[PDB]
Amino acid sequence: QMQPLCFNCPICDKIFPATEKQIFEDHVFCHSL
Ligand SMILES: [Zn+2]
């Protein structure tokens, strides 16, 4: 446990800040295509 202060893409391993929820969801969404 290191405090969820950043999101990570399990598809390509792309990680971003916690405030990047927009890019984290959109990013994964791309892999969803
Ligand atoms: Zn990715």
Curated annotation (Swiss-Prot):
(Microbial infection) Cleaved by S.pyogenes SpeB protease; leading to its degradation. Degradation by SpeB prevents autophagy, promoting to S.pyogenes intracellular replication. Signal peptide: none annotated. Expressed in all tissues tested with highest expression in skeletal muscle and lowest in brain. It comes from the Eukaryota. It is found in: Cytoplasm, Perinuclear region; Cytoplasm, Cytoskeleton; Cytoplasmic vesicle, Autophagosome membrane. A zinc finger (UBZ1-type) spans 6-31. Residues 1-33 are annotated as: Interaction with MYO6. Induction: Treatment with IFNB1/IFN-beta and IFNG/IFN-gamma show an increase in number and size of CALCOCO2-specific dots and partial redistribution to the cytoplasm. IFNG/IFN-gamma increases gene expression only slightly and IFNB does not increase expression. Xenophagy-specific receptor required for autophagy-mediated intracellular bacteria degradation. Acts as an effector protein of galectin-sensed membrane damage that restricts the proliferation of infecting pathogens such as Salmonella typhimurium upon entry into the cytosol by targeting LGALS8-associated bacteria for autophagy. Initially orchestrates bacteria targeting to autophagosomes and subsequently ensures pathogen degradation by regulating pathogen-containing autophagosome maturation. Dimer. Part of a complex consisting of CALCOCO2, TAX1BP1 and MYO6. Interacts with MYO6. Interacts with GEMIN4. Interacts with ATG8 family members MAP1LC3A, MAP1LC3B, GABARAP, GABARAPL1 and GABARAPL2. Interacts with ATG8 family member MAP1LC3C. Interacts with LGALS8. Interacts with TOM1; the interaction is indirect and is mediated by MYO6, which acts as a bridge between TOM1 and CALCOCO2. Interacts with AZI2. (Microbial infection) Interacts with Lassa virus protein Z. Belongs to the CALCOCO family. The MYO6-binding domain is required for autophagy-mediated degradation of infecting bacteria such as Salmonella typhimurium, but not for bacteria targeting to autophagosomes. The CLIR (LC3C-interacting region) motif is required for interaction with MAP1LC3C, but dispensable for CALCOCO2-mediated autophagosome maturation. This is Calcium-binding and coiled-coil domain-containing protein 2. It comes from Homo sapiens (Human). The chain holds residues 414 to 446 of 446 of the full protein.
